[PDB]
């Protein structure tokens, strides 16, 4: 309303509203992210099993 010669704001306001759903998130990592973890379980438990055995040994 500060502009008495508006003529574009409704177009611009609609332009914001038509692109109001800009873009979704990208949660694509659901197979490789845990593959880093599957190596993480493998090596950590390999280490933990060894150190637990060796500390008593």
């Amino acid at each position: 309303s500060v502009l008495k010669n508006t003529s574009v704001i409704d177009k611009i306001e609609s332009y914001v509203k038509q692109y109001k759903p800009v873009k979704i998130d990208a949660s694509k990592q659901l197979q490789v992210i845990e593959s880093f973890e599957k190596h993480a379980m493998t090596n950590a438990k390999e280490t933990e099993s060894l150190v637990s055995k060796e500390l008593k040994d």
């Binding site: 880093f36 190596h39 993480a40 090596n43 950590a44 390999e46 280490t47 099993s49 060894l50 150190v51």
Partner: protein, 85 residues
């Protein structure tokens, strides 16, 4: 580019280090070692076992055996130097 993972890689790293070479050495040096002076075999019984327990043991280790040897020559006075050359 990602989270690096060298916190847990000792399962194959505990082979090349120098202390591991000493580790595998002295543990074998320990298990069979006799605990508290066991199996010393202090009861020696072989021919002159009495000698093995008085002077031949080594607790005294003095000139007594040669004194015994000298006295044996003295007791053989009329066997080697007398009645013979």
């Amino acid at each position: 580019v990602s989270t690096l993972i060298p916190p847990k890689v000792v399962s194959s790293k505990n082979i090349g280090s120098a202390p591991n070479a000493k580790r595998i050495a002295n543990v074998v040096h320990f298990y069979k070692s006799l605990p508290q002076g066991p199996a010393p075999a202090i009861k020696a019984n072989t021919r002159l076992a009495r000698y093995k327990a008085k002077y031949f043991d080594g607790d005294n280790a003095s000139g007594k055996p040669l004194w015994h040897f000298a006295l044996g020559i003295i007791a053989f006075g009329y066997s080697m130097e007398y009645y013979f050359h």
